[PDB]
Design a protein around this ligand. Structure first.
Ligand code: 578
Ligand code: ZN
Length: 304
């Protein structure tokens, strides 16, 4: 069975996407936006009070297989949306005015692999010509300074950038969806762990984005808000200087598509448990992250 306070395997998350939609058709629609290399269904949940010509925020989780708290957050977010709509004024306004496109797990094949074989797997599970080595790093696979820095051209490496930008079915599916909905998508949020950071462009170069001041102020306010709940301290800034250079990232790509609010979240912790964050921290991690996500949503909505 599914639990919001445990890590759930893909079979369970999939059944959950169907169940939560079936139980809340007036707040959620489910579509598949493509298949993974191994033929799993890439679900996208449109969360919001349905209506004509609404703006949108796009959020994905599960780019990287071992970052289990990421997957857990997208599920937590959806329950908060459906349970508090109509009761909590902010979420009610959010869902009335805009849609959240929530992609609960992008790299499903890798996620399944962390359950069945190797808990520390990161990449996709696609084959590579000429080698037995498996997988591409999805967050090096976007057309954003592709493979120019902080990425490897070797399929056997953890940061393999792929045979070409969008070579992976999963990243092509995500990019295709965003390109087809650029007019409506006002913010792009991509959830990773760990490090307790909010990052914004750029990661493929040390150059700063045109609205750097605004993004910094927004990130600063969001981390302050997150800390109000349990005292958890986040840092923030441009990807390249705040953590390390990493070309081909989805946040940089989305930004260069014209989505002016583009953020990578790095959730708990700072290395004590790393990727193996105990289930006993899921609730607190998700609740504080909610505050930051809602702060950003409120800001974006107020600036349309
Ligand atoms: C502990 C976190 C920082 C994660 N990093 C990570 O697992 O690094 C593994 C690694 C292994 C070998 C070489 C280089 C890196 P992740 O969430 O994967 O960091 C991402 C990424 O590497 O895709 C990240 C790092 C820097 C900037 C961005 C935003 N574009 C995103
Ligand atoms: Zn990651």
């Amino acid at each position: 069975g599914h639990s919001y306070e445990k890590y759930n395997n893909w079979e369970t998350i999939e059944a959950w996407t169907k169940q939560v939609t079936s139980e809340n058709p007036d707040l959620i629609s489910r579509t598949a936006i493509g298949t993974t290399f191994l033929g799993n269904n890439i679900y996208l949940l449109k969360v919001g009070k349905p209506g004509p010509n609404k703006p949108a925020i796009f959020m994905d989780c599960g780019f990287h297989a071992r970052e289990w708290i990421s997957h857990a957050f997208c599920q937590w977010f959806v329950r908060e949306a459906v349970l508090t709509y109509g009761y909590e004024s902010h979420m009610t306004e959010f869902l009335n005015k805009l849609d959240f496109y929530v992609l609960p797990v992008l790299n499903i094949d890798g996620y399944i692999y962390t359950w069945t074989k190797n808990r520390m797997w990161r990449k996709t599970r696609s084959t590579n010509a000429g080698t037995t080595c498996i997988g591409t790093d999805p967050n090096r696979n976007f057309d954003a300074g592709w493979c120019t820095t902080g990425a490897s051209t070797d399929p056997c490496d953890e940061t393999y950038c792929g045979s070409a930008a969008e070579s992976e079915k999963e990243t092509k599916a995500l990019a295709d969806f965003i390109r087809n909905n650029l007019s409506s998508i006002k913010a792009y949020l991509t959830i990773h762990s760990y490090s307790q950071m909010i990052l914004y462009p750029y990661s493929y170069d040390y150059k700063l984005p045109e609205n750097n001041a605004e993004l910094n102020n927004l990130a600063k306010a969001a981390v302050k808000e997150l800390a109000t709940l349990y005292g958890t301290k986040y840092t923030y800034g441009p990807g390249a200087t705040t953590i390390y250079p990493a070309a081909g990232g989805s946040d940089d790509w989305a930004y260069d598509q014209g989505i002016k609010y583009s953020f990578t979240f790095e959730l708990r912790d700072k290395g004590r448990y790393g990727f193996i964050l105990p289930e006993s921290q899921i609730q607190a991690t998700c609740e504080e992250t909610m505050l930051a996500i809602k702060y950003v949503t409120n800001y974006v909505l107020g600036h349309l």
